[model samples]
Target: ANDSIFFSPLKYLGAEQQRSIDASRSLLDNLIPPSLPQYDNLAGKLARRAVLTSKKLVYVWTENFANVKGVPMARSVPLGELPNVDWLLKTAGVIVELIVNFVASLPASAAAQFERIAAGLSGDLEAARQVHEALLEEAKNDPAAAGSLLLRFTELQTRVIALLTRVGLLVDDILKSASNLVDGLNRFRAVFGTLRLPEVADSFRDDEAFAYWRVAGPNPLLIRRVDALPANFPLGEEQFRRVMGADDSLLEAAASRRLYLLDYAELGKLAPSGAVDKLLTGTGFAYAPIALFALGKDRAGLLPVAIQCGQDPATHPMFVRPAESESDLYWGWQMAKTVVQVAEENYHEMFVHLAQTHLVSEAFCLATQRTLAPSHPLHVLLAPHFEGTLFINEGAARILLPSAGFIDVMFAAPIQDTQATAGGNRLGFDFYRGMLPESLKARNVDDPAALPDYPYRDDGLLVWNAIRQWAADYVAVYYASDGDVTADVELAAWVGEVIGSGKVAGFRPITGRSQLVEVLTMVIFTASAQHAAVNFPQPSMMTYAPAICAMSAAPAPDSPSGKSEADWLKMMPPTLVALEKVNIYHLLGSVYHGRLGDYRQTGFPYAPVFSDRRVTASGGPLERFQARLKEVEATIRTRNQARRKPYEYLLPSRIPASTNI
Candidate 1:
């Protein structure tokens, strides 16, 4: 259980349910078989519902589970507050007892007849003749109305199957949702506590004090907003100065580029200093480089602020200057254009999925009422039930839904590098180098027409492929490229340590060359979405890749010049940093957009399950994959049809109805 990341709660429930269903089916095969035409219809109905119940339970459970953990908005609710699970369990128990009583009520001779029927008639004529003789004798001796017995059996089977399916679904839904609730809360607490960001952690508690929070779960979406815009962003020159003054250690760490273990006293001190300088005054404000310098120190409080600067051009001073279209700033602008577009498009599918989730929950509640209280208001009037409240409210829904109209915010804000000078002057120039914004944008839109509406159309596969391909290209260019940029030393070391732990868990691939890529994509996607919820969190985005690459190339953070804060930053190649940042941003952004419609809300409507839909569509790999699946299914169907033999009186075609009997 400590190794929680690798565990899937749904898998265990699915296995348990499957085992139960298999055992139940086996029991049914021996009791009421297909050979008896009169009872076969009832058996067939039971069999279908049994399997359907299991599949629907697992499918809905998985969808709800992923919604909580994967999405940025959904939250967790109290286990006691879900559907009336206790009532469902009681109902299931009653159904089981009802079936048990039916079996116990049969006479000894009838029981013996039932066993002969269970054994089934086949093979030698002598054994078949014996079975025939037994059946005739039972029929002659039968005193109870045949129609009434069959009617009772059908009613009993229907009651049991219906309850089993509903109970299984509700039980698994609670289990999966509860597991995610615990894991998500623990992970959030641990990470925030480590970062010493009590303010961030406190916000969650204050908002989710009475409930749980997730991207798209039953509790509610954690939808908060930034009050200050570009003009009054946090971590500006004034705020930075105030924060530094409050804690001398943070200022020292920023200057030294070496961070120490910090606590809430310092992290929570985000107090603003005296008068603020206009960001656009004269030469671009001094806060840009100062923020970057502090970020290099890896201070917990500064990370969020630094990223806010990169999220919008209106906030970032670097993008305000006039420049040629060939400049780095120009390229970043183009990339931002694409990211905003992709994000907007994705919002369409994501909101629909969220709506569907709410609608499904509402339907389930209605079903629950029918099962527990058939007489509706009269039943409620007689015996009240503790059904849970609606998970989402309109106020919260507005935030989770797409912002009214379109977001005009910019993504490609330029980073001003004071270390890099222009001509003979020591003054730094504004550049957007290395963030790979252009290349990432290009890949995402390589074939725009192929990009599907997701869950609404069969096209989004091409867009998914583009996103995947971009991630691969990102790794190749930033992490797997030539010397120093090839491997993440810390990550590689962590991997080795994990392997040494002797978990020895084997890898499984699904629709990807390596599970590693898929894993990375999910991680990167989470980071991207989480950041997008507020702002992109990569501060000094231009320098992140090169900084990490250099660290990867060298054994330590020490540079050729005694590792002074300025010297350490100076050693970082702007181009590498830019390239690295762009790739990281692009992959994160692409994944954030691509997962918009990646969910299933129902099983009865013959809806397409999108959990395994390809990222890319059109006349490429995903399209071909779709074609191959159809071809395989068709071939299998044809072969199965060919293997079927004409039935020779499989069962009596004519059967007396209860009335006729």
Candidate 2:
């Protein structure tokens, strides 16, 4: 037999979903059309109220549209446009049903006359009221005609049609404005303080903002000290001297772990999407770039000193700082940065964000359900963290991972096997190695003296420590020694499933109490804090499409004149597309689902995980866990006040207990 199971994974895992999750998605789909004016003032208020009262999250999986249909998502409309499409369907269907049910009692002839009269009210409400009065008078005198007369007087069917017509016109108006909406993204550059915009756009050509983003931007894990520069990447002697400045030497800077690398060598393995390949006649332009950075003499900023657009320096060539000469100042340096940004963005989305955080968390989430029993404390401890995760991942697969999905649609490169990539990453994940202190050290960026401000590293460590303590407290209350962790057949089964079915590699058997606590901490941290660090700041990037566009309008530049600024603008996605992308991120990061410490609190803000009545005493496990979280929260606020910019992704309150987005 092959590796395949008896049935599709969906038979057991994918299709089944909770009522609250289904209701949550349905409610938001009804309440807010994400297509509205960033939803402005009035609509946002309604959405906030709707979310606050409901225990459920927002936006149900949509399965209907003109063209698309099936499961978790039907791609006829993007995530933001689903509400509008759902309203369109509801409007037509509800009216037809109302009329059909009403007409069941009346003759066809009377039904036509009623609909004709209803049609007349489309132009004027006064006309409907005028008819309403006539219907009321006739019914008042005759009791036999009361049913149809009340229906006519209420005019709900007509009202629904009228509302649809008006709202349809507004949707048309919103659609027309989409082209201009792309331009509106500029206003948000200031609002979000994105690396690509207001900060860099104002500085115009300064690379300092570029360097800063590596430390605090969307995916902060990319930049790491160049312990040993790859042979394929070449940095000239004079070029190296210019960037390192007056006093520093190459080996000295490298020895101090000040020289850094932003490597996207993995991009070379990906193939361009059908759209991109066809756009350029089976020869789409993409990049596999590596950029070198150094700490400048100013002791303050990091700068991109050199960039190699491909692996080899021969055909690919290298672009270095200060132009190396006169024509060097042309467009080469800028184009170099653009290529890195493109590759970096792709790497951030695929390798780090998708594979590492989102998909890896999923493997563990699935194992928890398949292996553990409801009464199990380990099961309850991890249950809330899986809330809406499957729903979110399913939604993502449609728009982000499908063959001609969003990434394939917008960006040229699509993964050969998104599932395989995700599974491979799951297999590669190391429990202890992924921990904040360990990861930062391995990346060679843990030295605060050398690498001053890393919001992800600094703030993440704070959140990570608190979650670990909570995990430790929770584990201790449930189990006494390595004995229970190993002795419990259920615990053994859960770990085996996670290792065998989940494809999570590295750690094998449970050896000690610390081992279980650390594993639980890894699972908790990845779902909550790690995802936040990579996920939230995306709106800032998606808004400025021209800066790091996934695909370009023209091929890579080859001359001193290079590509015109006008051509680069064309490289950006249509304003409408850019706007949708921004809205998608806004949808993902907008909600504050369950907080990290909410379950640990005295009130127990989340759902009742311990239905079996295996409860912890007050001021004991739960209290200490909550107390540790509070201390972390206070310390994060203090650090934010003193730091250059506040890193809030890992802030305890901001992180959702699950990857609900």
Candidate 3:
């Protein structure tokens, strides 16, 4: 008999390398979703604790029951004093029931509706709002409604309250359990990692401690099915073929039969009537499960397939404007370049340390708050999306990819014009390789003298300035040593001595402060510019055209192209100038205060790397300091620019044709 399980070597399991891999897997295995079991386990633990604390009651695993052991004669014991076995078990059952209900409640066709909602809002808000309002009103107010996640949530809340108060037992203790349950539930729902057999699917790979990549192999058929493109895909067959033809890798892999592309309009067919529309149009998009549905990757195939969000071909060109397009293509790619460069330049140790340390989610949240006005529709759509998923393992790695901004990255490579290649008649959309004829250029349509024109507004100049400032400060602090500030020449030596040896010195899984500061510097210098550039090239990057258009058209300075180098230099934001000074001072502190002190305070004002301090403490001093710098920069830029302008660079255009053969 070939008994594989009994005969298997099991030798592969005991090696040091295997042990390390298992350890890494163990850390994330519990973190990835399928939290129902964990919830049950939590309840069990709570129950056990409650029982252990009650002297009058004893628990018996054999019978799966509890009994009163040391009872006084003729006296009735209050139910509160009895072991909370029944209470805990019931609550656990309810929690699991609620979770299962939520999962089962989702309609199979909900994915397309999310795409539709995303596209609709991007193309036109008033139209999107009409659908949005009707759907949400019905779901939230009506329990018998198709959109039952809200209904389930409401039911769960009531059930929890009843469970806590029904017994009228130890009120404080019960309340404590109630609070823990709610907080844990919120976290579980917010991230809610989904599982794929053999390996759990999440943002980050589970086998490596410092890699920003996905776990792919032994694909799981998570999506129910994949339907082919409609007879008339928004982009015609000719255009679609040309677009697909631009990159060979797109179709080179064998057909995985894992992807599904459905018509945006026909989503209701597969969805549970109102369920898809309601969730997509309302707060459901805020959750990672749905946001990932709309924006994350589906890896059940030879190649990862991105869920194409709702888009209308007719109005799609108006979404990504040329300037915005350029910004998105340029900065988005540049950010990835910096990460790779650092890693390749023998700074892998430092790079991973930084990756593991920075408070990316916190930074993303604060930056979003600083830029987006409250009550704005974008605030409604993206605020929670970013808050909940930005720093998750997969989310973090995705942000570092060459195509970080989903909308811009996906649309960066334009469709090839078969007509243009064949020398056919020049149609209005026949432009190729992102090139614009001189005649089409709207040069100096608005005079720089009349408007607020700053060179920093130019994507090129803005990126250059940020890199220059960040690099200078990095050298001054990290390289400077032994009572003398260092020069660029000493950088390699400093990195070799400090980072080379330090990388694995105390290397454990913890986020160290020294590493956190270095990571912040990396982001401040590189990622921050990428964040700013996200709006450039177009507001359509996030799918909010009107809001993006309104901001782009508002009074702002054009690039100071005609100005001399000295004048351009003087145009730097006052906040940036202050930041430079602060950075230099901090570097000096590193030399004078010593390495330990500098690690605690120097670098960007990030939160404490190792502690519950992020949650337990009041306002973060470092984050606050960083915000002050940002506020100053924004204020200066705002004050220096004009309030209104004609012929602003806000018009959207079709994806340009490719020049590549």
Candidate 4:
């Protein structure tokens, strides 16, 4: 019994809870389910929160979206900007997600037709522009040349007319299905409203946003602080002045600890095997690019000092951004930034968000359910945070990790390579390194005095400390001393199962009250806060795919490339690919289920069994936890009021109890 929880793992579960699980066989029979969870399991808390209604029994996804609409912001933000919420708008929003899932899941040959048609349109447009531009030069140089050029232009124009006519027919054909989907999107816009664009609409072209994104964007988890530039970044101070301006030197910035690196070495190892190679030229490529950011001379923020798209100094050119006098590397600079962002997104989805938070948390959920008794104090503390985790994860596992599916369609790298990379990355997340404090320290971004103004770090520590206190207080009620934790058979069994099943290598069995608090904090924080940090940003920011993206259509280019209009278009996703992403990520982002500390927040009702105070409560552990969360929410709202862009993903009021989406 002391060796491991190999048998009787569920023996500790209370009899009623064990009975409920035994009755869950029918739910378990549906191994792979629809992404939307309508099949409720027998777990009392989960079934109660599963959003299965009579409308859900017979209707389409509209009813399921009603579950999403329960969120104050999910239906429509009230006062201004968004439209008034209604059942119709909710129906449209859900239908759009359904339609796009169909769009993403289309067979290769059918999907290829849209890709082909878009290319046909773009190719003809490019050809016509080339001749039209050439004709003007001919007119200036030679009359005879002008006459010939005019003849060619007229022919090209006629061809375009026919091509346009052909596309008109294709549109007529596809719209038999397209008409409804587009209508759904239009209504989805009706409620969500039009997206606001800043003076810098093409956010990719902005320097400050790029730097700010590292701290608060879709993938804030990247950007490890480096003491100095890595050895392979082959650039110097004089070249830095070209981008860094006349007075600044890169060497001293590194010496002063102002330099940070975004290293995508994990991505470089992934082979881009699953991309639509024919449709996407060389843009489906992945690289192990290294970028350097130094604190700007103006002290505004960290600016990208240099970028190398690939690890090799020679094969991939290191781009120093345009100088005061050197503006010719215009598109080249954009290309470098594109490469970095694309790689970052790959790292983000495949490893950081998916593997690190969701997948890592799922393993813990499994271990906890098997080994910990349902009536256990630790179980009660951990339950509310895991509300929608297993529901979303179990559904996604089938689709995301298949031979062919939505992720492979949406992402550049093959699913094969992505799973491998995520698996490889998983081994690095043992107990010591995976926790927030250690992660920050390992990345060298832990000290606020050294590398200042990190919203993820700053806001995260707030939530982490608050959770840590609650964990400490809760553990105190159950654990009398370190000796109690060390001697607990159940705790040791849970630890053994975690190491064996989670495959987290360095995590030894915890032996003290402090370690118990640390373990609880990590579990609760990852399930709620760490997930909220990464997952919530998807629909708001990632839905607009061009600025920050999972993949690009054009390959990383050499410096000094020409700024041809058509070439730039080649770099972005096709219209449908971007649209599908908008739909896909929106579904993931909108749902706000239950809130932290409050079992029954605003719209969601608390399960009766979970709310049974006599089972696990004596004093005010939960009451105090909720009070701290209230202060954390107030604290975040104040911070957002002063920020350039309000970083609100981790705000306690906004964060869900689980990672359902």
- Candidate 1 residue-wise lDDT at 272: 11
lDDT of 4 by residue, 177-230 (tens): 442343112322222233332222356568778778788876777788776667
Candidate 3 — worst ten consecutive residues by lDDT sum? Answer: 283-292
- Kindly indicate the candidate among 1 and 2 with the higher lDDT: 2
lDDT of each: 0.25, 0.58, 0.24, 0.61
Model 4 TM-score on a 0 to 1 scale: 0.71
* Model 1 lDDT per residue over 1-661, tens place: 5656567665465533443344334333323211211123565545544643453332222112221221112133322222222222333443233223322333555444333322221112234334334443554577453322332332233343454654344333322332122222232223111122222233321212111111111111111112222333334444444434444443454344322111111101111111112221111111111112122232222221222212233433321111243243333322222221122222211222122223222222322222211211111211111122123312123322222110101111111110011110101111111012322232232222322111101111222343345345433322323332222322232234222221112212122223334433332322222123212222212113321221111111211112333332332222322232233233222211112222221111112222122323355333443454344334434533542221110011110000000
Per-residue lDDT of model 2, residues 200-298, tens digit only: 334324577777778888778778889677888877666688656666677777887678898876554442322355321232345677788888644
Poorly placed runs, candidate 2 (over 4 Å): 1-205, 271-275, 278-284, 323-330, 414-427, 430-432, 557-571, 574-577, 600-616
Quote each prediction's TM-score. 0.18, 0.68, 0.21, 0.71
lDDT, residue 116, model 1:
38
User: How well does candidate 1 match the true structure in TM-score terms?
Assistant: 0.18
Task: Name the better of 2 and 4 by TM-score.
Answer: 4
TM-score ranking, best first: 4, 2, 3, 1
Give candidate 4 regions above 4 Å deviation.
Answer: 1-202, 271-283, 561-563, 601-619
Model 3 Cα shift for residue 416 (angstroms): 8.6
Q: How displaced is residue 553 in candidate 2, in Å?
A: 2.8
Q: Please give, for residues 1-661, the per-residue lDDT of candidate 3 as tens digits.
A: 5758866876364433443343344233223222111223565445433433442232111111012111101122222112122223233333333223323323435333233333332243233334334545566576454323333322333344344343223222222232122211122122122311111112211212011111111000011222243323232333333322443231221133222221223211111111111210110010001000111123311222221122333321111101223443332222212221111211111121112122222232333233322222222222322322222222223321222121111111111211111111111111111111111122211222221222223322333333334334333332234223222212222233222222212212213334323333333322233222211222111111111110010111122123232332221212211211222112211111101101121111111222223312344432333343444445445543632111111111110000000
C-alpha RMSD for every candidate: 28.3, 15.1, 27.9, 19.7
